[PDB]
Design a protein around this nucleic acid. Structure first.
Ligand SMILES: [Mg+2]
Ligand SMILES: [Mg+2]
Ligand SMILES: [Mg+2]
Ligand SMILES: [Mg+2]
Ligand SMILES: [Mg+2]
Ligand SMILES: [Mg+2]
Ligand SMILES: [Mg+2]
Ligand SMILES: [Mg+2]
Ligand SMILES: [Mg+2]
Ligand SMILES: [Mg+2]
Ligand SMILES: [Mg+2]
Ligand SMILES: [Zn+2]
Lengths: 129, 70, 143, 96, 153
RNA sequence: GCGCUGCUGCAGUUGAAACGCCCGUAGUUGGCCCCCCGCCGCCACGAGGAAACGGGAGCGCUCCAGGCAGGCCCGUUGGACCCGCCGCGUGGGACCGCGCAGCGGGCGCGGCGCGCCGCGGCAGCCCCGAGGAGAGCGGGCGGGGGCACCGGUACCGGCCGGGGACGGGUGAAACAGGAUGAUCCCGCCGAGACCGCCGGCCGCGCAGGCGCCUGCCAAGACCGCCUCUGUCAAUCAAGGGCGAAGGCCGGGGGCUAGAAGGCGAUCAGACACCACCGUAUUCCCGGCCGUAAACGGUGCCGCCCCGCGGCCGGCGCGCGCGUCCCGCCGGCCGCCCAGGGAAACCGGGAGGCUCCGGGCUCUGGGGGGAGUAUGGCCGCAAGGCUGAAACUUGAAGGCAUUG
């Protein structure tokens, strides 16, 4: 059965971008998907997207512009301490200069840079670069 | 040339009703004159105010009529 | 996936590893206990025994030689082993019914080289190292 | 390794098939793996068909035929040149 | 067809996006309620009731006219069956299988099917015992199923 | 070292390794939705609680391993601070999971309850209906299952008649048959098996497996739908059921073939391959056993994914109305661009993975010894499930290249 909606969305996005497509459709919508996409948009990877209402299982449309090279999720939400972020950054990211790691906190969904700025920790959602 | 947000209405008619951008029925209501509304995919028997018998022939898909009705 | 990955699955993973780490030959040989009870030296660097027979053993098929060895009986176990004195012309220094110290070869408990079924080495006889007797550093005029 | 994608038989959407006997050695073979040919031949060999027709009294008589189906096993087909051992690239050709 | 089989078709129904009644609707929310009343008095299951309403009276969806579903209306009117309909039908099918089997007991596929049906019955009955739709004492027994069928029908 | 114990982070078509299949409890995992209340986890901070060790600020034991010293005109000279917590407090409240039992005012005492009162104050009190599941109606589809019934040649045996010398069998022969009339032709009778050509990159079934006529009984997937319910779900130790052929117990039946056995050839030998005879068995009922190269040598659920084509079932569109062509769902197949791989090859994944995290279950860790010994459980038995060690060994294996 379906479980991780975000994983399916990200796999579809990467698949489409691989063959240089321009638009994608991901079937189930969710708040977490929306925040993930908003962060991606603010960082400049996926431009604009739209949410289509149908009362059940809202669909989404996203517009691509290359740029993105990889995206993923970490299924079991591990609890990163505030001072334990560097190890995950080194393990997961190609370099310590341009990748982004997403965390969910009591202060909301933000990036690892922002969490380091506020010296707080939380749970990990995913990554993109 | 093509945008996924505003599909051509016709290419949408050729797709499955659940895979469409918005799920919707394939069925409709219609009038009959032997002067009442009848379901397109009727399965149970139907009768007129006057007709003493049936005016429906259930099938796999769309119902058939007795042709006397127009 | 193939492996369980849920957030509340530590017990199953621990049990799986506990069961499956017994399939390694080395881990079994170390942590099972049969080898310790079967090893005549009971996990010791070397042992002290009495030589009772001086014998020569042929080599394997691709080689051709007769290696010089002695039969020993360990004081603290009373069991029997075969120990081999490698250095040239060092058999003549070993005499029947003599006190010896016997150690192991490089490999833990496997045969070494073309010598069949031999796992021990002679290093001291009558209290003097064989390596020292071979170099003439000392003499065995006490025996 | 694997030599043929069909595993030497034509078996789809099933578990078991009925068996047949080779007509030469009477070996039991699955129906999907046996080599089948259909033949149509005259009862009288064509050398003497004209002689028979001349001797025939009836008018407009037609020589009857024989309709038979021959089924052979793999070993017997090869030994009797019914099929041939082919090259690696020619094994995929399916036309007669 | 997934729970107890290997198939996976997708034959379903797709209701309209808009919840409003038809422009040619000529029924107040009550008039249907009486029609439901008299139909139920004739021992008609709700699924057949919806079929009859849709075909004969041109009502695509009851909820769009009355704001409520059929079984809720029946419960408010005190006419809903004590035993839910899906479970009752499963028990009917089980009884039929058992009868055909006691006529002749060399058929193994029938036993296979009976096993599947009883498993489904147990699962659904457990769910209904939870959610307080059935008494805690309710239990399904093979040898007394026909009795419950008769009384609870 | 060893990513050869793998949480990070192995492998499971062919090298070692996916239970024969289904149901199923514990266990693990579970779509989307409410802006703030309470509780659990979570993050941060803090209190409290021995040092030594470790980290670490300052100081020239001549350096150093060390030690806490030491300088004169010293922070009050100094020995600062951190580090053994599944508990306690404050805050946050995104994420993860649980909240069935009206409210507000007056009597009514300072507050809270048990109660009595206007309903006269409230919008009084149901997200939606998952290309999740289950139930329902209609339609056809199919070697799917069970029971009774029934036709047809053919093998075998017997009989009436005809005719008169060989016949069978093999690479070639020889054992068995024949003037008591064989082989051959025709007709009748008996019994028991079996279901042909059609018959298939057709189809059905959970798998094992499924093919005469007629009739009966129950069942099932798929499609179509503005029918119903409302998370009822996925996968699974234990447990339960089914399970080719051979085999076993007790009853029936007896025609073909045919383990064992016998006999003729061949060979140096032939107790085997070839020829002939032939018991158990092969068939039915009731019941055990529970194994197969039980193979797609590829576990189940779920998502995305180049292009071309064939076949089966159902539905819809179009016209010049053909069982035409244009589509949708489901199933069975072929070739193949990317990509992957040790390669053979896969590509309806063996892809989307060292750029290495969707969920659940099982198995494997060099080759032998050995699926052996010893225990336990099951079984009438044959045997099945579970399952070592000592000892020995340096390669054993896979895909491919040239001869
Ligand atoms: Mg080969
Ligand atoms: Mg098979
Ligand atoms: Mg299941
Ligand atoms: Mg599906
Ligand atoms: Mg390995
Ligand atoms: Mg092999
Ligand atoms: Mg293997
Ligand atoms: Mg049998
Ligand atoms: Mg297997
Ligand atoms: Mg991996
Ligand atoms: Mg091994
Ligand atoms: Zn043949």
């Amino acid at each position: 059965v379906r479980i991780n909606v975000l994983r399916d969305a990200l796999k579809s996005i990467c698949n489409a971008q691989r063959i240089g497509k321009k638009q994608v459709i991901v079937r189930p919508s969710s708040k977490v998907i929306i925040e993930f996409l908003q962060l991606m948009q603010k960082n400049g990877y996926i431009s604009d997207f739209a949410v289509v209402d149908n009362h059940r299982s809202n669909r989404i449309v996203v517009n691509l512009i290359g740029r993105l090279n990889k995206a993923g999720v970490i299924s079991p939400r591990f609890d990163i301490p505030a001072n334990d972020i560097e190890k995950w950054v080194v393990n997961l990211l190609p370099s310590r200069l341009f990748g982004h790691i997403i965390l969910t906190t009591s202060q909301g969904i933000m990036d690892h840079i922002e969490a380091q700025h506020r010296q707080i920790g939380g749970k990990v959602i995913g990554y993109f670069y | 040339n093509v945008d996924l947000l505003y599909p051509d209405p016709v290419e949408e008619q050729r797709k499955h009703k659940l895979k469409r951008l918005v799920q919707g029925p394939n069925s409709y209501f219609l009038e009959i004159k032997c002067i009442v509304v009848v379901y397109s995919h009727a399965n149970t028997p139907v009768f007129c105010p006057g007709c003493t018998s049936q005016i429906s022939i259930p099938t796999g898909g769309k119902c058939a009529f007795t042709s006397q009705v127009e | 996936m193939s492996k369980t990955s849920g957030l509340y699955t530590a017990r199953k993973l621990r049990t799986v590893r506990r069961v499956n780490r017994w399939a390694d030959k080395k881990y079994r040989k170390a942590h099972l206990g049969t080898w310790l009870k079967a090893n005549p030296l009971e996990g010791a660097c070397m042992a002290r025994g009495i030589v009772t027979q001086k014998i020569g053993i042929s080599a394997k098929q691709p080689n051709s030689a007769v290696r010089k060895a002695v039969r020993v009986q360990l004081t603290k176990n009373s069991k029997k082993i075969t120990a081999f004195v490698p250095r040239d012309g060092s058999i003549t220094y070993i005499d029947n019914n003599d006190e010896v110290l016997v150690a192991g070869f490089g490999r833990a408990g496997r045969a070494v080289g073309d010598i069949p079924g031999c796992r021990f080495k002679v290093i001291k006889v009558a209290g003097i190292g064989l390596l020292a007797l071979f170099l003439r550093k000392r003499e065995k005029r006490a025996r | 390794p694997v030599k043929r994608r069909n595993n030497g038989r034509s078996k789809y959407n099933c578990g078991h098939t009925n068996i047949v006997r080779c007509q030469n050695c009477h070996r039991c073979v699955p129906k999907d793996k046996v080599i089948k040919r259909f033949t149509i031949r005259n009862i009288v060999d064509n050398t003497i068909a004209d002689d028979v027709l001349n001797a025939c009294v009836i008018q407009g008589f037609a020589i009857p035929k024989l309709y038979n189906k021959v089924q052979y096993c793999v070993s017997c087909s090869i030994h009797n040149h019914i099929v041939r051992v082919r090259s690696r690239e020619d094994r995929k050709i399916r036309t007669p | 067809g997934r729970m107890h089989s290997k198939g996976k078709g997708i034959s379903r129904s797709a209701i309209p996006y808009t919840r409003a009644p038809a422009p040619w609707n000529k029924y107040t929310p009550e008039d249907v309620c009486e029609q439901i009343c008299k139909l139920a008095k004739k021992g008609t299951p709700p699924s057949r009731i919806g079929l009859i309403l849709r075909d004969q009276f041109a009502i695509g969806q009851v909820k769009n006219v009355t704001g409520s579903k059929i079984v809720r209306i029946l419960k408010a009117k005190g006419l809903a069956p004590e035993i839910p309909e899906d479970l009752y039908c499963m028990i009917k099918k089980a009884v039929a299988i058992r009868k055909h089997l006691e006529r002749s007991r060399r058929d193994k596929d029938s036993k296979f099917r009976l096993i599947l049906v009883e498993s489904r019955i147990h699962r659904l009955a457990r769910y209904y015992r939870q959610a307080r739709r059935l008494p805690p004492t309710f239990r399904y027994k093979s040898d007394q199923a026909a009795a419950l069928l008769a009384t609870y029908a």
